[PDB]
């Protein structure tokens, strides 16, 4: 295939180690996939997602009405990294302390870009994020950690006024999650205080900035994937090999009233 | 379905008559479908055709390479017409001279727009025609009808220099076909003179202007259809019913050297 | 094998596309293979073709008669070309307008060299062409296109005086074939005028210069192949891949009276 892995100077065991390390880190650092419906890979031939809408266009001639079908293009994200042939070779010698830090960093970068496109928007890819697409009024996250549950209750009140149902979930930023975790009250963390309110789960969202309270009934958010995360090979040298992590995706929000955003 | 035919004041017999009359006229007046590969209807959900190419785009952030997948949108052509309820009603009385001239005119219009988009281009739909996409030099159709075969032989020489194979076919305009038909030499029409050269067929192309000599080996032209020609209903009155003929399509040319264009 | 295709950064689909495109163009531009017997590939170990003749040589010593066996060596023709990794990669994305023009040009070049060696001679390879090996007197192709059939009839008279039988065939140059095709008489091309005389076929020979009338009974011309046309890999870069088209061949003419040559 287009990955050209058979041409890389890497053994099966080292390939397995790299894949495992990247998968673990990405699954750690990814959050949107846990609260958004995912349309499984449709193949490399997939390039756009139809919206079912029509756009006006100049007719070819008299007596003819012309309309253009509307589609959302898919964007390919590629993050390159470099690995050492010595660490690669040591694996077949029964070594199991090899350095895969570039792999972990690339996985973190890819997860962050994906989550930031989902929750904030990537305009050049025509991706409007949940924050912008949300219709319910946005709130402000208090500087202190003790007042956050009140704001979350207000956001639940807003959604739950608007008429959305299903389990509710709170996605918190790295800085906010650290705050609610370190901070404590009556012998419990402010994070447990927050958890007490919702029916769903509390989720880490390091890539995003602020906080988000959203419904998970289904049918409101769609992450379309052409091809899932993959690892490939570009070139190599006497000392290093250059690889990349690739994924082709787009994001769509259909219900603007199923989420509430809180800004720092 | 979206046609809403069940709501129209028309009987099954009249529906059949209208469908038959439109199909006959369209199949008469259509030419590109006889020399271009047709990708059958893929359903109303189809909105674009992937090209497999990539487009450069600003990255979300540092260390990330971003590319956009390239697709060709589909365009919907709708031609409205009006029919008389008296002619509709007469059918169930065993009448078989009913007037379907508006149906025939609408079918002609739709065929003409389709063929003109295929052979000349519809820019607003991002459709580049065979004439523009052709790489072989264009020729001029002589005013006289006696020199046309020489120009056709020159065009065959150009294609057949360029290295294309398979049966060759000549599509002639209405004005040019009338000329070669009426004109005669040695007791045979100039059209038969033309036919003597090629291995394929001589085709009517009223919508196009000029003439075209092209190969039919396959894999060079693709007419993508989302939905084929259909007839629908908009509204009705005590005297008339308003209908439309609809089709969603796009056209792609892959080989620029498989055709030669001759301009009036 | 020596092609080293497994080392090239090309997918199976792109390999198939390149092979198909090269085969089509070569089969289009090749002519000698249609009128000469072909000895199928005998393997890479084949290096020469015995003639069964003997050559005089100085003896090792007294009372000894020494002779050397005579053989015709085989010559390997290699034509390099370059391909773009972007066009290669687009194929797996369902792209089918990729550029293979260098492939087509290399195939044309190889076909032209093969046909020119067959019909004109490649001295350094000890290949004497049909033109030189022919014993029947050579003719001159008239500048005008109207007198060519008379010269072809004269050439048939010469062969057919000399006593050769079997279907006869005319191989025409690019410039001569264009002339006889464009030129017309009594509503038929001069090429059809020519075809009327012979029992065999009229053949395109762009590589050759002039015209040739020859018999196809069999046993007079032999194209010996060690290995048929093949495509290989030399090296690659971040943007391009360097490939070559290779064939090992030689040509032998046994009957000097089975052909007649016409010079421009």
Numbering used by the authors:
A (entry chain A), B (entry chain K), C (entry chain OA): 2 to 265
From the paper:
To investigate the assembly of the Enc{tdNfsB} construct in detail, we performed single-particle cryo-EM analysis of the purified capsids. The overall resolution of the encapsulin icosahedral shell was determined to be 2.22 Å based on the gold standard Fourier Shell Correlation (FSC) 0.143 threshold (ESI†). The calculated diameter of the shell was 24.0 nm, which correlates well with the expected solution hydrodynamic diameter and has a calculated internal volume of 3000 nm3. The crystal and cryo-EM structures of encapsulins from close homologs, have multiple openings in their capsid shells, including a threefold pore and an five-fold pore. The cryo-EM map in this area was ambiguous however and appears to be the superimposition of flexible states. To resolve this, the pentameric subunit was examined by 3-D classification and resulting volumes were refined using local refinement without symmetry constraints. This isolation a series of volumes that could be categorized as open, closed or uninterpretable. The open and closed particles were pooled and refined to yield complete, unambiguous maps (ESI†). The primary drive of this is a shift in the pore forming loop (measuring 3.84 Å between the displaced His188 alpha carbon, see attached movies M1 and M2). The underlying cause of this movement is unclear and may represent an equilibrium of states when resting at cellular pH or could be a result of different packing states within the particles stacks.
An alternative, promising approach involves protein capsids, such as encapsulins, which can be viewed as genetically encoded enzyme encapsulation, and is particularly suitable for immobilization or within physiological conditions. The capsids, comprised of 60–240 subunits arranged in an icosahedral structure, engage with a conserved C-terminal encapsulin localization sequence (ELS), or a more extended N-terminal encapsulation-mediating domain, found on the guest protein. Our study showcases the encapsulation of the nitroreductase NfsB, which we produced as a fused dimer, within encapsulins.
